[PDB]
Ligand binder design. Structure first.
Ligand SMILES: CCCCCCCCCCCCCCCCCC(=O)OC[C@H](COP(=O)([O-])OCC(O)COP(=O)([O-])OC[C@@H](COC(=O)CCCCCCCCCCCCCCCCC)OC(=O)CCCCCCCCCCCCCCCCC)OC(=O)CCCCCCCCCCCCCCCCC
Ligand SMILES: CCCCCCCCCCCCCCCCCC(=O)OC[C@H](COP(=O)(O)OCCN)OC(=O)CCCCCCCCCCCCCCCCC
Ligand SMILES: CCCCCCCCCCCCCCCCCC(=O)OC[C@H](COP(=O)(O)OCCN)OC(=O)CCCCCCCCCCCCCCCCC
Ligand SMILES: CCCCCCCCCCCCCCCCCC(=O)OC[C@H](COP(=O)(O)OCCN)OC(=O)CCCCCCCCCCCCCCCCC
Ligand SMILES: CCCCCCCCCCCCO[C@@H]1O[C@H](CO)[C@@H](O[C@H]2O[C@H](CO)[C@@H](O)[C@H](O)[C@H]2O)[C@H](O)[C@H]1O
Ligand SMILES: CCCCCCCCCCCCO[C@@H]1O[C@H](CO)[C@@H](O[C@H]2O[C@H](CO)[C@@H](O)[C@H](O)[C@H]2O)[C@H](O)[C@H]1O
Ligand SMILES: CCCCCCCCCCCCO[C@@H]1O[C@H](CO)[C@@H](O[C@H]2O[C@H](CO)[C@@H](O)[C@H](O)[C@H]2O)[C@H](O)[C@H]1O
Ligand SMILES: *C(=O)CCCCCCCCCCCCC
Lengths: 459, 67, 170, 120, 104, 547, 155, 46
């Protein structure tokens, strides 16, 4: 993994040593080259994973998440440079440096063998994240509202640290390869119930789980576009990636300890989709859309069948590209009207014809139109949870109806109908914006031709 | 505009549309009469329908009332 | 092209044309038009390509995996022996998925081939599909997403205990 | 038909039950019936790939019609005689079913007549 | 119940401008200033059949004959119907007739 | 098989070529609509060659050409089932689409986005042919949702109109409710069997098929707009008239019926599902026919005519006659697509007037439109030996002589009579009488695109039923022995419907003052299903969201 | 926007009620808050629960598709009352009568279908007969076994 | 602005309900599988 760590670090000298007017050109060009070389990680095997060294490994789960992470850095740079153009030069380089350091922690996080090494990096990603959201965020409101920092660290980060420390004492190691052979069953015990919650609550909050999700809409309304892109696309998948790994050592206690979280996810899947129908803020609508989609991933991970793990991996990648594109589409409107209200500017298809095509494609993938990988992932989770209990088809089906409703409602409200009379500064879509959208959707649709490389290790 | 609009009057027609409308109206009636002549059974009935009250006890194998 | 024994097909019986109408058969004429405008030009192009291929002849091979001890022979917590047995079990699991796929493809090919008589003429294919699916279910069903040779063996021993017990009951 | 008014409004005791009839021995009342003879062998229908519902006691006339239909193409008007033989052979079968229903009804009346001849 | 004298005057003044504006939407003769019989129907159709039928079937036939049909069970025919009195091409077999039908 | 299979795929591949050429390959936006019509016309010719081979010797194939994905023991491939139903439906749909596209070349002439309109019709056709030829459930799902989205994009064509956006989103809502049944079948077939292939499903032939078949009945209920999920089809009239012609004939609405026909080997042996689809169809066929009696919008009447005929198709499925249900899909596509093209011809002449109360006196003013409308109306109402008679007549005979629900049979016969009433209603108010339209007369049907497009469907509406019914092979034993009063029931109630409708129409001329009735308001307002359901259901959901 | 032109806490005193009424461009007699409870509406006006389809379509609205003027207070549930969603326009038939006729129609048809199952229609014919033991072998029956024979006789 | 400011500024019951619906179903299903009374003849995908 040093062939990706070292070039990523070298983006920092490159950014600080570029000519003043070349910082965006230089970093975007070279970060796209790192993204190109990330495709060499797809040297996967049917039986073994790609174990590079004592610290890092890659398997079919982390590999697609790594490629998505490395793809997103150039896209974030393209999306950020317009609104940072009035920023002074030293602050543009610090902003770029935060994004590079965020990628450095993410690629290391997804490949760490040792779960304690994963924990330190899994938390180090918050330092660049909060700095980006707060220092370049919209308002004076605190994303780390204090209550959320306390609840998360007390009920999430700290219990996970103690559980991991406890596990290594008992097992003698937290290397994930070792945990595959030395795993022992978890018997019923009040102490074991608390180990289970400790091992899972941190990832539940980051997913987020329904009932622990109110932080996510607040963060999106405050974050800059790059913040929303990384947060939606990857940072939520850190919780999903963590659960897919740590559930190896939690059986068979997950057989019953998962019921409350499945209930929260199955019900919260419908409650958050319905909320999307009465959202007045695009960024909030997309944020609640992510909660609904990540409810499927939690259910898939907790019932742990081969089909649900394949569906979970596909869902995480598909949502990453789709939710990121939706935030970029909303941001482009915001950069003209300077408001997140969804009802303010209407009938935009009349004024921006091609951008309306990007909107339609983003909405069709969001509502899981076949054969997009959005549906492939969602169908697999639906197929698996039907076996878990046939009644779930009712809740899964109803959510499919509602998801189509708010996806097209968002498309209809903003793109169709009569345009707003007094808004007279809607300039034609820039090449930068059109290319930003097409770099989201083309890879998303091309993956329909070869879905196996996003189906994870269970494939 | 080879057909001028008129005010409060019957529109100007062409011969081509009137002749074609009549040819296909007359085709429909020729077809219905031609088929009815040759396939009248399809409308009235292909085969006779027996009256079961006529079948004798011998052929239905009904034993005499005292057997 | 493929192996006829693995993917069997019965001998084809096509009845001879026995026309009883003076009208020309437009299908036979379109067949000649196809055999002339489409097949022959296509065949010429392919034959040229296959000539280039014959000039350059190189070979690829089907990888062979020597057998190693199973998980039943590994020492507890001996990862070095558990690793090789675990990889071997995964390879066999992947192969067994494709053995079931071959049997399903036979069943589906049979149904289409037999037309309206498939219920009687595909009973052998149905029986074979039934037994293979049963054997696959016995091995690998209900192991979970975190399956392994160890959990496969635990399932087997549990099944072996139930079989052994019902023998006493008999 | 009138038979439905009889069974639902009138006396259902002397009306054949469609889902269970015949309820009397086939020989009863018949000094030695003949069995129905099937012309088409069982392999012939299998080769012809007849639909199972079509593999009844008329299949030989359908096997003939399907052969002529293939052999007269393009002429899709070339098999009216083969088609009519199959249609007629099916009509005769339908009439035979109509006799069984009447036979079952007549007998159910004979039973009733004899049951109430006794108690009298 | 009609227009007040100011209402009529405002309407008249907006009529002049509105009608002048619409007259100004008409295009000049030069505008837009752009930058720099059976055979015909047969050629258009003949070239269409070649590009949109012949080439596609050449590619499809090549694909099916040499790439699809060379893999097992990719194109599965329904077996032809055999009727009594047929002659099998592959073997020369002769399917026997059916029994003599009873009169009908 | 080399010619059969090659020509089977070139038809599909050919229809996608105008889509690929949109990437500026010799692009000639001068006449893209003409290019699309030509591709359909050539696609019709090539599709007729496999059809002849099937007609000849019953040849059928499966083409599983591309292996897409394997999920352990579930291999997914791009597989096309080129069988009885695909053979015969594809030429009909291509023939009908060819006429609708030539008609659209005239109807949509002034639309600035003419090219985009024709691209959407082509995609709308492609997703239907993915549906019909699909050989596994996943590929069937791609087409199933494909038509749904194109329905949304074409119903909401005029996107500045809020009513158009509301009808487009209504179609999606009602159709995705039906898709719960589709995924339920997919989940059941994957779990209880181990396949989404139709071949392995029929080979295993489960008896405990209530759950997967209730899922398919629900999926067909929404897509083909049976009672319960039906209001969206009338609402879909917001789209341009050429959209309604395709929607109501050779694409979306018959997909629900087509799905149940595909699975007849399962519905054969399930008397419970047969009883559900019989009753489900029977109420639909009557209820929608009753609604059409009092409608005044010409597009609404024809839209309810479709729901009533789709109800009759669902009845045919429920009396265990799937091959007659298919024959009705084929025949119905001819005269129903024509009726929409005749309404559009009238609507266009009268400057976008769709209310029959503002029509009248068109019998001579529009002679060729009148001829096609009369032929179309007679074909719809089962006039002997026209295209509609070869399916409707046999369906009523087969329903009469089956072991059937008695109430469903009576409701099916009354709906047949009502068909003659609203068909008369269109002829009486649109063509007869004195003109009731504005004083500046722009009536002009003299356009070769309009004449030729309607003429081809008129020829189909005369001979298509006879030609098809004489070429398809027997798959059932048609029941031809039956009493006279059951044999002639369909014709008799059709004739009494015509007689009973003349009296009602003529009383509109008496100088008597009407009096509204509870029955009249019930039929006019569509039984109040939209007014109650479309207000109450959104209210409960939307108010629930905020709190 | 300043903080004094924004929604605030529930108004207690008539002086405040005046201040909020002015804040919302409403007259004092028209203004009324929502009931003071945990719902958290604040001092936002409670406006008539009507859809935008009831507003004069001919008036020259600033937002013609929403039929809203600029500066006019927006109903709380406005996004639920846009012309694409809930409509409250007066109906030609009273709401309660509509529900009784619709439910009465569905109730009467469902009952009648149940009766139709109880008393099915059928023709006066015996069962269809099939050869070879009711097609025992064709229906996939086991050929190692022998079926108890079914015999059909001529009538 | 005032509208979107105010807007942007039952409960456990359904969760308890759904818990008993699914928990009961999966207990009935689990019992049948151990008694061999549940048909899974061809079920090998999960
Ligand atoms: C090597 C690999 C390298 C990567 C190569 C990637 C290639 C990407 C395409 C390059 C395009 C370049 C170009 O010049 O296009 C010009 C092309 C034509 O120019 P235009 O006439 O001015 O129209 C553009 C306007 O925006 C107006 O656009 P529009 O509104 O006319 O187009 C809308 C249409 C556009 O969507 C389409 O692309 C049509 C094809 C969809 C099929 O979207 C839809 O209709 C959505 C519904 C789709 C039907 C649902 C079918 C289900 C899937 C069926 C799968 C079958 C499996 C079996 O413009 C575009 O379409 C740009 C977006 C295309 C992106 C690809 C989307 C694929 C889906
Ligand atoms: C003041 C803080 C109070 C914290 C209470 C946490 C419960 C204590 C658990 C515990 O100490 O159990 C002891 C066990 C090891 O003890 P040992 O003697 O080796 O053997 C145990 C059984 N034979 O320990 C273990 O097995 C490891 C237990 C996992 C470590 C959990 C860390 C404490 C926090 C647990 C809460 C997790 C959930 C977060 C709260 C929000 C949940 C929504
Ligand atoms: C349920 C399924 C759901 C599917 C959803 C996804 C939809 C995708 C869109 C549909 C695409 C259909 C076309 C697929 C054909 C292309 C792929 C292909 O043909 O594969 C290569 C082929 C042999 O097929 P093969 O790849 O071996 O199949 C196993 C897969 N690895 O070998 C060849 O192709 C060689 C043929 C040579 C032909 C050359 C003709 C000239 C080229 C002109 C093009 C320019
Ligand atoms: C026999 C078996 C079949 C039985 C099926 C029973 C289940 C179906 C019950 C009916 C479903 C509700 C129908 C509501 C349709 C609808 O709301 O859309 C139309 C409506 C506009 O109405 P419209 O009259 O066209 O507009 C006036 C034109 N100016 O549009 C609107 O006003 C609002 C549009 C936004 C929609 C939000 C509200 C969605 C309604 C809740 C759906 C929840 C999903 C239910 C899934 C249950 C399935 C298990
Ligand atoms: C899209 C563009 C992508 C560009 C990059 C990928 C293209 C690379 C193509 C190189 C392929 C060469 O593949 C190579 O072909 C030669 C043909 O003699 C073979 O060569 C070998 O084969 C046989 C015997 O083994 C002999 O004919 C030959 O003397 C020997 O050297 C190699 O065993 C094979 O590996
Ligand atoms: C799967 C592989 C498929 C390989 C296909 C290879 C491409 C072969 C096509 C090359 C020629 C395509 O030509 C493309 O279609 C027709 C051809 O007449 C043209 O269209 C032309 O004919 C139509 C009617 O026939 C007219 O309406 C149009 O005005 C005229 O320009 C398109 O403007 C052109 O862009
Ligand atoms: C194909 C055959 C179809 C036949 C369908 C027949 C069943 C449908 C019945 C719908 C009407 C039911 O009517 C039921 O009684 C009356 C009106 O009838 C209504 O109640 C009221 O209606 C009207 C108006 O106020 C009054 O004249 C009536 O006296 C009063 O009872 C009930 O609210 C309704 O429940
Ligand atoms: C006799 O021939 C039976 C078949 C003919 C049609 C029967 C008509 C049924 C009358 C309606 C009864 C409704 C009971 C719910």
């Amino acid at each position: 993994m040093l062939k990706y760590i070292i070039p990523t670090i070298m983006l920092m000298p490159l950014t600080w040593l570029s000519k003043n007017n070349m910082i965006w050109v230089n970093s975007t060009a070279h970060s796209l080259l790192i993204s190109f070389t990330s495709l060499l990680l797809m040297n996967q095997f049917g039986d073994n994973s790609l174990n590079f060294s004592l610290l890092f490994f890659s398997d079919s789960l982390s590999t697609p998440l790594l490629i998505l992470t490395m793809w997103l850095l150039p896209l974030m740079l393209m999306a950020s440079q317009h609104h940072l153009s009035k920023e002074n030069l030293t602050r543009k380089k610090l902003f770029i440096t935060m994004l590079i350091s965020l990628q450095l922690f993410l690629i290391m996080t997804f490949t760490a063998m040792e779960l304690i090494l994963f924990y330190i990096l899994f938390e180090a990603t918050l330092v660049p994240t909060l700095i980006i959201i707060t220092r370049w965020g919209n308002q004076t409101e605190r994303l780390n509202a204090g209550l959320y920092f306390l609840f998360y660290t007390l009920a999430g980060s700290l219990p996970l640290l103690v559980a991991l420390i406890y596990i290594q004492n008992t097992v003698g190691s937290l290397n994930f390869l070792m945990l595959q052979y030395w795993v022992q069953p978890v018997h019923n015990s009040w102490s074991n119930v608390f180990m289970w919650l400790a091992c899972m609550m941190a990832f539940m909050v980051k997913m987020p789980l329904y009932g622990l999700h109110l932080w996510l809409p607040k963060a999106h309304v405050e974050a800059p576009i790059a913040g929303s892109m990384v947060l939606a696309a990857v940072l939520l998948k850190l919780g999903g990636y963590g659960m897919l790994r740590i559930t190896l050592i939690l059986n068979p206690m997950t057989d019953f300890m998962a019921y409350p979280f499945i209930m929260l996810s199955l019900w919260g899947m419908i409650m958050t989709s319905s909320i999307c129908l009465r959202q007045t803020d695009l960024k909030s609508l997309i944020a609640y859309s992510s909660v609904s989609h990540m409810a499927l991933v939690i259910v898939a991970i907790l019932i742990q069948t081969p089909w649900s793990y394949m569906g979970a991996t596909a869902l995480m990648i598909a949502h990453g590209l789709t939710s990121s594109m939706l935030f970029c589409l909303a941001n482009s409107n915001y950069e003209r009207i300077h408001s997140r209200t969804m009802i303010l500017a209407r009938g935009l298809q009349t004024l921006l014809p091609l951008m309306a095509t990007w909107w339609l494609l983003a909405s069709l993938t969001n509502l899981a139109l076949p054969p997009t990988i959005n549906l492939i992932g969602e169908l697999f989770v639906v197929m698996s949870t039907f076996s878990w209990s046939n009644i779930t088809i009712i809740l899964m089906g109803v959510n499919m109806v509602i998801t189509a409703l708010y996806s097209l409602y968002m498309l209809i409200m903003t793109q169709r109908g009569k345009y707003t009379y007094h808004i007279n500064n809607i300039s034609p879509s820039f090449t930068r914006e059109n290319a930003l959208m097409s770099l989201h959707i083309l890879p998303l649709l091309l993956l329909t031709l070869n879905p196996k490389i996003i189906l994870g290790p269970l494939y | 505009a080879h057909i001028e609009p008129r005010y409060r009057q019957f529109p100007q027609l062409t011969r081509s549309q009137v002749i074609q409308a009549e040819f296909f109206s007359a085709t429909m009636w020729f077809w219905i009469l031609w088929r009815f002549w040759h396939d009248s059974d399809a409308v009235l009935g292909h085969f006779p329908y027996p009256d079961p009250s006529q079948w004798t006890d011998e052929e239905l194998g009904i034993p005499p009332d005292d057997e | 092209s493929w192996d006829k024994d693995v993917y069997p097909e019965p001998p084809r019986r096509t009845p001879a044309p026995s026309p009883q109408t003076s009208l020309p058969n437009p299908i036979t004429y379109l067949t000649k038009a196809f055999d002339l405008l489409v097949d022959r030009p296509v065949t010429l192009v392919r034959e040229f390509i296959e000539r280039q291929h014959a000039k350059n002849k190189y070979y690829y091979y089907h990888r062979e995996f020597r057998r190693v001890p199973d998980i039943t022979e590994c020492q507890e917590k001996d990862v070095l022996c558990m690793f090789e047995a675990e990889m071997q079990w995964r390879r066999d699991y992947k192969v067994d998925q494709e053995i079931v796929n071959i049997i399903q493809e036979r069943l589906k090919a049979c149904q289409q081939r037999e037309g309206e008589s498939h219920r009687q003429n595909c009973a052998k294919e149905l029986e074979q599909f039934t037994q293979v699916v049963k054997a696959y279910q016995d091995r690998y069903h209900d192991l979970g997403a975190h399956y392994s040779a160890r959990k496969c063996l635990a399932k087997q021993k549990q099944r072996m205990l139930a079989e052994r017990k019902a023998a006493k009951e008999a | 038909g009138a038979h439905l008014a009889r069974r639902y409004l009138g006396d259902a005791s002397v009306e054949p039950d469609p889902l269970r009839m015949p309820t009397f021995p086939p020989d009863y009342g018949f000094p030695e019936r003949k069995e129905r003879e099937m012309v088409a062998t069982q392999q012939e229908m299998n080769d012809a790939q007849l639909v199972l519902q079509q593999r009844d006691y008329c299949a030989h006339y359908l096997i003939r019609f399907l052969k002529c239909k293939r052999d007269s193409f393009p002429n899709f008007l070339a098999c009216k005689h083969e088609r009519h033989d199959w249609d007629y052979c099916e009509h005769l079968d339908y009439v035979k079913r109509m006799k069984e229903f009447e036979r079952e009804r007549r007998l159910l009346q004979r039973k009733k007549r004899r049951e109430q001849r006794e108690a009298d | 119940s009609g227009y007040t004298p100011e209402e009529k005057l405002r309407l008249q003044q907006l009529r002049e401008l509105r009608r002048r504006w619409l007259k100004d939407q008409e295009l000049s003769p030069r505008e837009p200033v752009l930058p720099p019989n059976v055979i015909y129907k047969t050629y258009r159709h003949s070239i269409f059949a070649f590009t949109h039928v012949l080439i596609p079937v050449w590619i499809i036939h090549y694909y099916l004959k040499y790439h699809v049909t060379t893999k097992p069970y990719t194109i599965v025919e329904k077996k032809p119907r055999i009727f009594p009195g047929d002659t099998i091409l592959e073997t020369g077999e002769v399917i026997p007739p059916m029994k003599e039908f009873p009169d009908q | 098989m080399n010619m059969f299979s090659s020509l089977s795929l070139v038809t599909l591949l050919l229809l996608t070529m105008p889509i690929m050429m949109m990437s500026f390959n010799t692009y000639k936006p001068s006449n893209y609509p003409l290019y699309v019509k030509t591709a359909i016309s050539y696609a019709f010719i090539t599709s007729m060659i496999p059809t002849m081979m099937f007609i000849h010797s019953g040849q059928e194939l499966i083409i599983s050409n591309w292996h897409w994905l394997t999920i352990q023991t579930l291999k997914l491939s791009l597989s096309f089932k080129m069988d009885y139903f695909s053979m015969m439906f594809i030429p009909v749909a291509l023939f009908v689409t060819w006429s609708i596209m030539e008609f659209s070349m005239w109807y949509m002439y002034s639309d600035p986005n003419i090219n985009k309109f024709f691209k959407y019709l082509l995609l709308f056709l492609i997703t239907m042919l993915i549906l019909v030829t699909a050989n596994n459930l996943f590929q069937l799902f791609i087409g199933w949702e494909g038509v749904g989205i194109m329905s949304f994009l074409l119903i909401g064509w005029w996107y500045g109109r809020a009513d158009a956006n509301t009808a487009a989103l209504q179609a999606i809502l009602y159709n995705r409710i039906g898709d719960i049944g589709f995924i339920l079948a997919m989940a059941w077939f994957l779990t209880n069997l181990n396949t989404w292939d139709l071949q392995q499903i029929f080979m295993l032939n489960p008896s405990d098929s209530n759950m997967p078949l209730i899922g398919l009945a629900l999926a067909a209920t929404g897509k083909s707009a049976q009672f319960g999920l039906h209001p969206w089809l009338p609402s879909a009239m917001e789209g341009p008239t050429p959209v309604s012609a395709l929607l109501h004939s050779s694409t979306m609405v018959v997909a629900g019926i087509f799905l149940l026909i595909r699975f007849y080997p399962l519905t054969e042996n399930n008397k419970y599902i047969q009883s559900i689809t019989l009753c489900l169809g029977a109420i639909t066929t009557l209820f929608t026919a009753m609604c059409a009696l009092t409608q005044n919008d010409i597009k609404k009447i024809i839209a309810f005519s479709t729901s009533s005929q789709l109800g009759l198709m669902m009845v045919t499925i429920g009396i265990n006659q799937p091959y007659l249900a298919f024959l009705h899909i084929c025949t119905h596509a001819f005269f129903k697509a024509m009726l929409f093209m005749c309404s559009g011809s009238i609507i266009h002449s009268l400057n976008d007037e769709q209310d029959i109360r503002k029509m009248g006196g068109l019998f001579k003013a529009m002679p060729f439109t009148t001829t096609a409308l009369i032929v179309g109306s007679l074909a719809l109402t089962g006039m002997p030996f026209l295209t509609g008679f070869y399916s409707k007549d046999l369906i009523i005979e087969a329903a009469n002589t089956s072991y059937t629900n008695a109430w469903a049979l009576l409701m099916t016969l009354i709906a047949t009579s009502f068909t003659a009433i609203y068909s008369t209603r269109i002829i009486f108010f649109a063509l007869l009488g004195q003109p009731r339209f504005p004083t500046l007369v722009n009536i002009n049907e003299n356009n070769p695109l309009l004449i030729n497009s309607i003429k081809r469907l008129l020829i189909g509406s005369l001979f298509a039923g006879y030609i098809i019914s004489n070429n398809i092979p027997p798959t059932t034993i048609p029941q031809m022995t039956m009493p006279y009063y059951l044999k002639t029931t369909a014709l008799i109630v059709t004739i009494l419907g015509f007689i009973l409708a003349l009296e009602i129409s003529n009383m509109t001329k008496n100088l008597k003052y009407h009096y509204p009735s509870n029955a009249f308001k019930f039929s006019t307002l569509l039984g109040y299903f939209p007014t109650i359901m479309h207000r109450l259901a959104p209210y409960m959901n939307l108010s629930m969201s905020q709190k | 926007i300043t903080k004094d032109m924004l929604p605030g806490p529930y108004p207690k005193t008539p002086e405040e009620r005046a201040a909020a009424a002015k804040k919302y461009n409403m007259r004092v007699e028209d203004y009324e808050p929502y009931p003071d409870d945990g719902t958290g509406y604040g001092d936002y006006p409670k406006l008539p629960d009507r859809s935008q389809q009831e507003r004069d379509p001919w008036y020259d609205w600033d937002h013609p598709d929403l039929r809203l003027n600029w500066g006019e207070p927006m109903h709380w549930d406005l996004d639920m009352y846009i012309r694409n969603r809930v409509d409250t326009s007066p109906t030609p038939v009273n709401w309660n009568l509509m529900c009784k006729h619709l439910f009465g129609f569905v109730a009467f048809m469902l009952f009648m279908f149940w009766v139709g199952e109880t008393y099915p229609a059928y023709q006066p014919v015996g069962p269809k007969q099939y050869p070879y033991n009711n097609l025992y072998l064709e229906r996939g029956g086991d050929p190692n076994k022998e079926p108890e024979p079914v015999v059909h006789y001529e009538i | 602005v005032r509208w979107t400011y105010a807007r942007s500024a039952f409960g456990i019951g359904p969760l308890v309900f759904w818990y008993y619906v699914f928990k009961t179903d999966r207990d009935r299903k689990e019992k049948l599988i151990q008694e061999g009374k549940l048909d899974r003849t061809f079920n090998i995908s999960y």
